[PDB]
Amino acid sequence: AGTMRVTYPDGQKPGQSDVEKD
């Protein structure tokens, strides 16, 4: 509910985020 198929929509160092899933 949190496996790292995460989006970085802004600010594309890590430690941005979105509510995409796996």
Side-chain angles (χ1 to χ4, degrees):
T3 84
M4 204 175 283
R5 184 174 161 276
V6 73
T7 73
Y8 298 141
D10 158 49
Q12 294 189 347
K13 353 73 47 275
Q16 252 291 4
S17 61
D18 58 37
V19 74
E20 184 48 292
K21 220 96 301 204
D22 57 337

